[PDB]
Design a protein around this ligand. Structure first.
Ligand SMILES: Nc1ncnc2c1ncn2[C@@H]1O[C@H](COP(=O)(O)OP(=O)(O)NP(=O)(O)O)[C@@H](O)[C@H]1O
Ligand SMILES: [Mg+2]
Lengths: 194, 176, 88, 196, 254
């Protein structure tokens, strides 16, 4: 009942959760942009940063600086969300490696939609269809890998999918422990290790 | 909800025992029981029945549905139908485990009963898997699961509900 | 309070704080010191002075400081192992 | 680049998903606060220059540093809050008096928060019943048998079971006792429930 | 497997050759002149055929003689990784037959026929010969014809033929006695005979000078390289073994 649970990710929603460690780590990942105005003193980090300069900076910073008329900067999509990689996902979602390409693939992609890109519709449909394609294999592997090494199953899953995988594993193990009668015993908590 | 909690609710179901002790009617908060007369049947909740069996104070009788022919008919009907069929108890799996683990001596043909209940469980879990896959593939927003039992739902429902929450947000992310 | 009654604290460099003798894995002081203790004497004297000095005006530039901020110069300490080679 | 030091705190907590509480990162918190101080001072100088001097092109840099300040605040608050979540879980997982090796991981203010939380939870539990409250820390698992057989793991002292009666919790001794009496000691690892 | 970026580069840059040469192998510090020479090897000269049938090759041949752990092998591996049709070879791993051409039987038919060796495969490309001092002289007889005339002549199977082997050679060798000896002449530190050494356009001596200044900057660079990690990879990850990660017939990011 009263176990520890972190703040849940809100990255698929309209805005991410303020206190979510997953959302913070997701928003740290870098996004390509172009500066639409010059920025004095900023050449110390990248003298001024000149106008029209290409940069890759964190998503949190890009969301802070961005506006719908692109005064400070304008945003480019990462290549995995552009039309080339969308087609690879459309081919077969089950063979791609969203741990390499993420590890927060869906959360980062959902947060890109707030930059008013012309291909927001294509991005949204791509994310939804990637999830639909990968659902059955996530379900089967999570609910039927029992008491074995799950690293091969978990390797190519993004963090959202890995969360779902652990949920399925929890259900499987709970029912199996009940069936074997191990759910009856009263046990010392996980803090008993020290 | 844990499988142990599902078992806790299954433990409220009524079963018939044959006491070897004499005791007048007892007025429990959840409803009175007894009187307990030696050698005669009396109907009591499953937790009490299992406790008395463990303390050697009664003989448990199988429920009316724990019969091999009836269970074979129900199993074949389940295997033939596409939808979940009505089950002989809303906690049939939990009932089977408790009664057969604690009272196999009292219940004849317990091996056949356990295997048939296992067959029904496998068929219905396969049907539930098909339902989940169809929901996600066809992008449903609602499903009808009339004859599923609580343990059967609880085995897969947390995973399924989390997946559907993510799917809903993914298909509504363009709303503003 | 006698000198032998004084409690002992060790400066953890990677936590940048003083920890009790009961919390560290350091051995307890004894009169007949070990060879390690004789070194630890002067190493600890250096340690106290080092941590104290780095928190004075000789502190970090800072790495955020830019040039218009931090237009004035500031000292930066070096250890002896650094000054050999291209630092000549 | 700014806000990199803030990520170390977040990564430290994230790479222990099991819920264990690491040592409080006092110096990391200090460093991010000093970074915020430097950011704020630079922004004060720049906004004074932009307003009094009428220099307009500094505005993007003002927004840059303000966004960085907001990020550092978010990371600090999230770190402290998740540590509070773990500490809050400890009361239910283990008990009231945390082990000393774990108390050394906590900050003094974290211990103050935990003491306030313990006091408030005790008040709430005390206010539930007609008198003597309801200890909702008990009955964490559905009840099976009224009595359980337990085995002493530690050399505890004596443990009262009735008004005038107690059991000596010497190691490897086995006692048949009420579950509601033994639950907390089993949870804390003093006793082992030995039927399955 | 458009031109505007390259035109802008050649017009905007001053001594683009220097920028290209120093950008050539980033993970190896120093060796600026050797990087310039390897860039010349990559670009190649121009092939000249005269009215009398006499011929001058365009390919540039480079030999590196040097002490242990002076990045000769890593320079060769860079050229293998980046040049088109760069063929790897080592002195003890190869033979003359494997260097030039072998008789094999077509499994489809059963008839004997030629199968091209490394230097024949390297035509209009590079062959990178590491451990070149460890090679046998009988094996280097083939390299003589290939470097001199850009061909290899064979008489085997049913065929007497002149195969094209117009390849640049990037050779790496250790001096005899392992480490270069200051108190011996270069022509006896170099164990190879002058007839073979005449084939190479450039011959560089690479010495592990123990100057502390160069040691400091080299060690700084090396430790920076060893601290690098790739972007799509977590801090604790061990290096994966390969798999079929290419899942479109054409490149997706570009
Ligand atoms: N100047 C340098 N800068 C960077 N790495 C270097 C340098 N010199 C040597 N190394 C490293 O040292 C290791 C050995 O280099 P290597 O390519 O074998 O040189 P080598 O002279 O060909 N060795 P050897 O075959 O015995 O002569 C590699 O990991 C190189 O990256
Ligand atoms: Mg070598």
């Amino acid at each position: 009942s009263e176990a520890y649970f972190r703040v849940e990710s809100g990255a698929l929603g309209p805005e991410e959760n303020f206190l979510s460690l997953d959302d913070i780590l997701m928003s740290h990942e870098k996004l390509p942009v172009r500066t639409e105005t010059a920025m004095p003193r900023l050449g110390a980090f990248f003298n001024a940063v000149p106008q029209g300069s290409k940069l890759e900076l964190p998503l949190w910073l890009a969301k802070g600086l961005f506006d719908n008329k692109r005064r400070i900067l304008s945003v480019e999509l990462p290549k995995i969300y552009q039309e080339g990689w969308r087609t690879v996902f459309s081919a077969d979602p089950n063979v791609v490696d969203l741990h390499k390409m993420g590890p927060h693939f869906y959360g980062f992609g959902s947060q890109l939609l707030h930059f008013d890109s012309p291909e927001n519709a294509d991005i949204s449909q791509s994310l939804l269809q990637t999830f639909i394609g990968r659902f059955r294999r996530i379900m089967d592997s999570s609910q039927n890998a029992y008491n074995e090494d799950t690293s091969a199953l978990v390797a190519r899953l993004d963090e959202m999918e890995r969360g779902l995988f652990q949920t399925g594993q929890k259900g499987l193990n709970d029912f199996q422990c009940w069936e074997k009668g191990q759910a009856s015993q009263i046990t010392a908590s996980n803090l008993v290790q020290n | 909800m844990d499988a142990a909690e599902v078992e806790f609710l299954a433990e409220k179901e009524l079963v018939t025992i044959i006491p070897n002790f004499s005791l007048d009617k007892i007025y429990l908060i959840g409803g009175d029981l007894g009187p307990f007369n030696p050698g005669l049947p009396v109907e009591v909740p499953l937790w009490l029945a299992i406790n008395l069996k463990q303390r050697q104070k009664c003989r448990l009788l199988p429920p009316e549905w724990m019969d091999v022919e009836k269970l074979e008919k129900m199993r074949d009907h389940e295997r033939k139908e596409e939808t979940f069929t009505p089950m002989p108890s809303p906690y049939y799996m939990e009932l089977t485990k408790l009664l057969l683990n604690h009272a196999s001596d009292n219940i004849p043909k317990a091996d056949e009963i356990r295997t048939l209940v296992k067959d029904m469980w496998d068929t219905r879990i396969a049907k539930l898997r098909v339902s989940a896959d169809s929901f996600v593939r066809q992008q449903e927003a609602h499903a009808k699961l009339d004859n599923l039992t609580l343990m059967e739902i609880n085995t897969s429902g947390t995973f399924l509900t989390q997946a559907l929450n993510h799917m809903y947000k993914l298909r509504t992310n363009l709303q503003p | 309070i006698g000198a032998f009654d004084i409690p002992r604290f060790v400066y953890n460099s990677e936590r940048k704080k003083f920890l009790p003798l009961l919390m560290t894995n350091h051995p307890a002081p004894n009169l007949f010191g070990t060879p390690r203790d004789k070194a630890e004497m002067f190493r600890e004297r250096y340690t106290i002075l080092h941590q104290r000095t780095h928190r004075h005006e000789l502190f970090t530039p800072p790495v955020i400081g830019s040039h218009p901020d931090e237009s004035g110069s500031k000292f930066q300490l070096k250890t002896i192992e650094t000054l050999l080679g291209s630092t000549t | 680049m700014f806000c990199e030091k803030a990520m170390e705190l977040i990564r430290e907590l994230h790479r222990a998903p099991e819920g264990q509480l690491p040592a409080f990162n006092e110096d990391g918190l200090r460093q991010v606060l000093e970074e915020m101080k430097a950011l704020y001072e630079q922004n004060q100088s720049d906004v004074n220059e932009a307003k009094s001097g009428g220099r307009s092109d500094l505005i993007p840099t003002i927004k840059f540093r303000h966004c960085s300040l907001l990020r550092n605040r978010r990371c600090t608050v999230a770190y402290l809050y998740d540590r509070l979540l773990r500490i809050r879980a400890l009361r239910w997982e283990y008990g009231s008096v945390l082990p000393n090796a774990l108390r050394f991981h906590m900050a003094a203010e974290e211990m103050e928060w935990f003491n306030n939380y313990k006091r408030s939870l005790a008040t709430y539990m005390r206010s539930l019943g007609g008198d003597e409250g309801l200890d909702i820390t008990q009955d964490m698992k559905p009840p099976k048998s009224l009595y359980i057989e337990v085995r002493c793991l530690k050399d505890y002292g004596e443990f009262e079971v009735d008004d005038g009666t107690s059991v000596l919790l010497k190691k490897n001794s086995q006692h048949f006792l009420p579950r509601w009496k033994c639950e907390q000691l089993i949870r804390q690892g003093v006793l082992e429930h030995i039927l399955s | 497997d458009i031109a505007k970026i390259k035109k802008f580069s050649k017009t905007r840059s001053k001594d683009i050759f220097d920028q290209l040469a120093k950008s050539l192998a980033p993970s190896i510090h120093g060796h600026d002149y050797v990087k310039k020479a390897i860039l010349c090897l990559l670009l190649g000269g121009v092939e000249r055929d005269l009215e009398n049938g006499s011929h001058i090759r365009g390919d540039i041949n480079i030999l590196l003689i040097g002490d242990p752990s002076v990045a000769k092998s890593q320079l060769l591996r860079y050229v293998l990784c980046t040049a088109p049709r760069a063929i790897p070879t080592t002195g003890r791993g190869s033979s003359g037959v494997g260097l030039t051409a072998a008789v094999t039987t077509d499994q489809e038919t059963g008839e004997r026929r030629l199968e091209a060796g490394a230097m024949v495969l390297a035509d209009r490309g590079v062959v990178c010969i590491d451990e070149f001092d460890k090679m046998s002289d009988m094996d280097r007889t083939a390299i003589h014809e290939v470097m001199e005339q850009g061909r290899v002549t064979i008489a085997k199977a049913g065929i007497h033929a002149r195969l094209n082997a117009r390849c640049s050679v990037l050779a790496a060798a250790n001096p005899v006695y392992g480490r270069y000896d200051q108190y011996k002449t270069p022509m006896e530190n170099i164990g190879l005979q002058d007839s073979l050494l005449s084939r190479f356009d450039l011959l560089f001596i690479m010495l592990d000078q123990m100057d502390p200044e160069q040691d400091r900057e080299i060690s700084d660079h090396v430790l920076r390289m060893h601290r690098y990690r790739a972007p799509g990879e977590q801090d604790g990850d061990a290096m994966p073994l390969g798999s079929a990660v290419d899942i479109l017939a054409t490149d997706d990011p570009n």
